[PDB]
Amino acid sequence: IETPITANFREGLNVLQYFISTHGARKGLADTALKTANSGYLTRRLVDVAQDLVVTEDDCGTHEGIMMTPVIEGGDVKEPLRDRVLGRVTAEDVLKPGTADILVPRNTLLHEQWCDLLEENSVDAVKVRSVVSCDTDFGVCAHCYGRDLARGHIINKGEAIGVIAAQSIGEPGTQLTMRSSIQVKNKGSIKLSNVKSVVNSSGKLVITSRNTELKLIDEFGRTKESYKVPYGAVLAKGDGEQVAGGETVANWDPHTMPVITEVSGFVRFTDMIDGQTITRQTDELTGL
Amino acid sequence: VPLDGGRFATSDLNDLYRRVINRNNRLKRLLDLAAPDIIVRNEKRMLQEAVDALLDNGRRGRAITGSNKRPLKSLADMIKGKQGRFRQNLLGKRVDYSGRSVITVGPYLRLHQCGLPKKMALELFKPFIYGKLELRGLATTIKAAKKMVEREEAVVWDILDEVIREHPVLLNRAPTLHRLGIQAFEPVLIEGKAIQLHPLVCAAYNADFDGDQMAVHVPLTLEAQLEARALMMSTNNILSPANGEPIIVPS
Amino acid sequence: VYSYTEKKRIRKDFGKRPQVLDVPYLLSIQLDSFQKFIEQDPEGQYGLEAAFRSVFPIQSYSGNSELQYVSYRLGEPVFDVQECQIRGVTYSAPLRVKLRLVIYEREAPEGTVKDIKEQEVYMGEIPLMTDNGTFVINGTERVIVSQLHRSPGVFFDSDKGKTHSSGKVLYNARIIPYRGSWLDFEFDPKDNLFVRIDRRRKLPATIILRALNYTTEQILDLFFEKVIFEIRDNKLQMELVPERLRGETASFDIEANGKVYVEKGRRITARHIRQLEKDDVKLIEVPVEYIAGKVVAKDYIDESTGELICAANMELSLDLLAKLSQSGHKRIETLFTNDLDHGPYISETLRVDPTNDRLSALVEIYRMMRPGEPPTREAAESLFENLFFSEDRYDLSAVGRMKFNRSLLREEIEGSGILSKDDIIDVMKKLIDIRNGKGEVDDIDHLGNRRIRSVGEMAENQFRVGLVRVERAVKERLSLGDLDTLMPQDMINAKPISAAVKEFFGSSQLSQFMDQNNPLSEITHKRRISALGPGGLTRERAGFEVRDVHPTHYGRVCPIETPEGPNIGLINSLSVYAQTNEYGFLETPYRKVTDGVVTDEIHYLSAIEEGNYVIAQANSNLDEEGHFVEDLVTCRSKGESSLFSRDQVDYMDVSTQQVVSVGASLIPFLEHDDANRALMGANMQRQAVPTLRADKPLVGTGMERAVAVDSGVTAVAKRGGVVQYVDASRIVIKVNEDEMYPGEAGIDIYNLTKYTRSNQNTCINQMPCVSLGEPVERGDVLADGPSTDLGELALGQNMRVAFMPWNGYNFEDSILVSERVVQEDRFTTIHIQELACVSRDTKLGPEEITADIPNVGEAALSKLDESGIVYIGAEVTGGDILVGKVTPKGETQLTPEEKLLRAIFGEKASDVKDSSLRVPNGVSGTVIDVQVFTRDGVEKDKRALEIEEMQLKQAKKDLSEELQILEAGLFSRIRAVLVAGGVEAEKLDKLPRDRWLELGLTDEEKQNQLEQLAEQYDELKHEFEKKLEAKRRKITQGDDLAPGVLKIVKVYLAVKRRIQPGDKMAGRHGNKGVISKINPIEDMPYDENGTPVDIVLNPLGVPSRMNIGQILETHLGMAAKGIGDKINAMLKQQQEVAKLREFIQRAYDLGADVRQKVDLSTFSDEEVMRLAENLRKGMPIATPVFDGAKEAEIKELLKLGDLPTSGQIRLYDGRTGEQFERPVTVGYMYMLKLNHLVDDKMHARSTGSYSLVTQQPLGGKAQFGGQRFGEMEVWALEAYGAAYTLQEMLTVKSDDVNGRTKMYKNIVDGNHQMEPGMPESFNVLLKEIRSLGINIELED
Amino acid sequence: GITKASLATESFISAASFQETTRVLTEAAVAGKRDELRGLKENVIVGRLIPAGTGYAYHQDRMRRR
DNA sequence: ACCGTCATGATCATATTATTACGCCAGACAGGG
DNA sequence: CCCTGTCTGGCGTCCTCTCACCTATGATCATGACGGT
RNA sequence: UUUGAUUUGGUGAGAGG
């Protein structure tokens, strides 16, 4: 509503302002009193899909597990690696970021002391054991689950993890709601992934691949920023380069899909006939 | 069973079975009498629809009804639904040795103990008090003990403080969402009629004190007392199982 | 000037806006609707006359008989309200109807009937309404609640977005009749037009246009324009109006008059349209490709062959043009089917149609209604004339015809109740216009489309359904009997009518049990706009938008008073000034702001008349004439608030209290509370309980007197005058002579209602509040009710509160209360429980109520009399015997000698077992009232004869005192008349007083008046004789009762529940709380005067739960008590009235331009002392809702008392005796006790009874039951490793019967051990699955 | 998806305590299905020790002694 | 005052029709390019 | 024959507390009150 | 060849958390 409620509660609200306030608050009470049914039915579906899964071994005997990286949406690094790899047992032994060192062994639980020795060495990402990669028939082994979470140690042989997991996902169901180009922020080094590129005539490295990931790696080794750069964008920078904080490093036009080339030469109209294939629309306000 | 009065409040299945038997008797009599084809086709069709209405009512076209327009409840409707046997009597049951009252604060408590009223304590612990009274030798038969606690003499409160002492109880707030909503305490007896609940523990139950109610349950057997002390005690739940964050945070 | 009870305690009033329309009578919806229902109403409608003239005359199955209608009449009820609530009857009135039977002859139904008969007939019993606005159905006072439903008429909704998953919106046009078959026109993604009738199968829409006897040529004449092609010598020229060409790209070069107008490849501009219409171009030239797809309108036939050239609604090709060109046709009529302007929806619809004439359309409609049966032309005509076009089965109301004409832009709002052809064609025209892009759709939640039914209209509809069942019965009987020998009471029977109206008032979804524990709760349950019930939506299905406040609830439906939980916004409460329109919509007052001046005339606007005009906000500043003092003023135009100029306004609101309801206008400082906390405050103010001595609100809104007087708990004076006799039972008013009838001499007697049971087990008392010899005015309180005081409304009590954290005992929301509160007996509420005991009739004989009872001794029977019933006054405990009743013996041991009765003793030797029916415990009390009802024929025992003699004696004394008191008033009238005209000063009292008529006086008005008083006196004599005989008949007779019951004993226990840790108290802003510790007096924080504070709240609930109004209420309450303490100081020192007059005048002026303006110079030195006697416990202050007391006025009133300006006193501690740092806030808050007590929720069970079908414990508290260890608790014990706890929690403690008896033996012997077994309810699951064709087992 | 996955289980009491019981009981009946219990809700239905918590030693013992 | 006639209450099988106004979301089915 | 609207079924939160309200009938032996002799 | 105290069902409406 274009006219706000300029009066607080210490000054008096008049009539219209309180009525607009009642719009805004009746919507919230209706949302909670109807949201609670979906939250409870979500907890029911979750504890009946889980329902069976019991910690029933001590090691499945595998070497597979998901690759825990810190998550980065495009702003500053949102959830650090110490939040994701706290108390989860590594899959293979993490190499120290210098060269080929056995920093941690390959079946160690990562409690707070190990995670601090991970944060000192600025470890990139940890290949850690996940429950979906567990090889145990009819249950989850004790290492592929992780830390007990309300006990400091590993999960005991027996403790029902499906039900506590289903409750822990569905329990915050009440608090949840129901109803141009790239500008860098920090100052570091450039790295490109999924890139197949070419240098244009002016010098800005344009990209012949749609799915290119533009990472900003710091001077230490960890990945601090990530972005998605489209097919055919004007990169102000290049691979492995050092930039300044706030300098624009990418540019494109999303309303005009570029059909840029790899080589040079002359242009011919192959199967382009005016009258059937293409049409003649001379511009009104420009003339070109 | 009859309700309070002189008539029998009959179940719906008796209507269903009585109709199937009425129709089956009619069909046997018509096959005795050699009625023509269309009569016994309607008779067997009414029996088919009667059996199909008995088993799963309303899966066929519009369900039959006795009183008044509401359809009557069949066997499959004794199984299925929110109020069948699974979701209403086998997964969740009503429970003896249990109680319920309004909560209040009582901040003098240590966080392994909760306040529990004397009237609820003498009602929930009637068999332990009976066993204690029969051990001392104050009475003889069970009747005498039930008269003693029906009168509430001066000697059963010492018996009650000697059955409480190291015996945990399960406090439970009514919308239990995660496992920290059932926690086991040790009772401390309360002159009053309200459960005194230690304040830090409230942030686990999502329990404010604006009119809330909680249920108490008594672990009867010995393995259940040990599970209440060793797994479900309130000192043992100081970290939320969803993460690593402490749940006994000062509110 | 002020009324005499307004000179008792005149409430201080802040407030700035001078009112112009006072609060109306708050119960006008119920009373006005039911007065509209039952009243002798001529000119047909509304009322019962509408039903009796729409279902009658019943004419027979061609037997030439007819049962027509004359009139109706309701006799008096046999039972008044008090006897009806005591005994348990309906409060009904018999409905006598005068019906007439006429019987026509042969060969002339337009001929003379041979015989008529007109007579009185009995049908049904409709329950009357009491003066409070409530019904008494079976001794329990019930309220029928107004329903909010959809307005009958057309409704053009748009199924937006969701269908077909391609964004193409649909448009449907639901015609909503008031009674009959629905009708939904709609579209489909192929842009065809589909009708449907009552959500049945779907047909193309034009099949009903053929059913109204339209040929296809006429249909295309209606729904399209025409395009004319003239074959004139060159390329089949065209008549062209260029308005159709607005933006169309032509296929050639349009030239005319030898001039190129339009080029090929371009579109026709608007200026080219101007050129062609300025030069008046008519005939243009088309190519052969232009009429390649033009759709012909009507049929062309060739004159030579007699065949069809081209059918109607067909595109034209080359060969069709070649055929019609050589047949002699020069004019070609086609249609204009554009992309944006006019789609060919009718044309595609007629191309999907298989039907061709009227008969096939009627056959297809008869086949979609009743599937699979042979149609016949007579049956199809009869069905389609009885769907929409008959007075019987289809009826829009006047509301329906108004909406149907208004939403189609008609002029006359009057029409027939049935549809016609023009109506359906206008629906299809408006639907096609909405699809074309002009015009708008209609929203649902807009209150111009939500009608309000009430008690009268719903009772009329249920009575009409009863009448159509009885017209089925009368049509059955009338032409299947011998005539003339019967009368019209042998035909019509009263069973379906009484069954229908008794089922509606008895158990409906809207005839609900009155929440009666408070005058506020009565007067806000009667004003309720429920959306649920029959014809409306349901809670567990819908929805989102209907639970939201629309912009047109402003001043009709309250935005902040609604129950939170599963139905928010469906159980809306109607606002204060909101009336109901003539049709049923909502309307609200406004003030007609003529061009400069706010004129003080009120003017009621509906919900759609409000939108067109522009309404000024309620609190806009104006300078003594009406001229708006600003030049930008905040207004709202069309559902949207904005800022408008000074003199473009058309209406102003009346008073600033009109957005809210009466539940949430007793909240002081409402504009400072966030809306959630105001909602919770209004709902808990409804949930209060009446205390023992209700005090007053120190900080009210002035709305208390409307809620108290305009409800029915106080004893309002009817005619003013002088009080003659006050008593705790009765009050006698002597009526003043300038208010008094000439005859029926008249002094009124108010019989108050002493201690009796309410519905919520409170104690509805009435206390007399007037002195003796005191004048009272017409319209004035005499007896305060429950939670009233001097005619005000005192729900809870006002106590000294401090906001400080005090050692944790008020942690989340808790409240900490001194023992000074419980010592003063000030929350000690009084509850009354009714305990019934019936004497049924079983086998081996009837029961015994006598006190010769087995298995009991002296200690039980000392509290009973010699006939079983407990005394009146015996203070009992929990588990004594109230009524002794013996029969329980069952069949412990089958009688050896079959039925050996006459052998040992008289009847039997106590069967085999005996146990006098002894009751439970948990509650104390004092037996205040015992009722004994006896089914007639049964021997009355000695106590039933004692109650009969008692009530005979009471009614005898009461009617004799009626005669004596009215005779005393009559003799006082005779003395008042004989002051002049033959006065005898000494001779008047020498003779006996009954002869004051034959004294010396001529034929004047005085001897005429003495003759009229002799007529009145002899009428009172014979009336007293016949009424005492009838009252002896009513006491002496039996009562009709249940099948097979001897006598019913009802006993009223009267518990007095005080306060304890665990009760729920709350203020009036949402500050809830369980009281957590009842401290001693010494521990309370006191101040540097000495007084302890009573209640210590918690400050931390204020910044999060944003209810900042309670702190302003606290400061203004402290100001009020400061003025009260200064009055108490100036009066305790025995000071003369001059200083009291000075100080009271200074405390009543004190403000800005306000409304009160009192002066004590016209109170005359005796009322000022009594006004100060009423002000010494504090000075009441009114603070209206949105025009309240600002901060500076509270500061100036805290400066009048010698209190600190900031409101905060420094407070010492009680324990340490040393000062709290940073001085704390004290004041008075008006706090309410709620009836969620703690000795009604607390429950405990070791081992009780067990259910029958599944061997699990019972549920509830009255049934001694156990708490449900539900499913999520089972999940929470699976989530730990607790395995034995869950095994005994669902096998031993709950279900397995041998397991739990082994458990009970093992617990009383000290061996904690369980033998598990199986749940018996799992065996019930096996029997229910096995009772199907399924074979479930248990292997191994 | 979770409701299609909990109704497609090799234990028909687990898939019958949850949503529609008609479909699951006819599928299990005409298949002749058998419920080797082996989970939490089968043992909450049938009234014995949970095979997760303290009862995991009891179910180790019973699974060893077959 | 006894005998006969009208009236009125027990027990007992007989077996189903004249409203509409949720919102997705899978899952199965006749239609047609 | 592979997309496709269209129709039919199947979900929709736990725990607790208070109150009221509960099918019609169509046919007959035998008891029960009323009037004549 | 003689020992026993035992059982209060659906439907719909409303409130608390």
Ligand SMILES: [Zn+2]
């Ligand atoms: Zn594993």
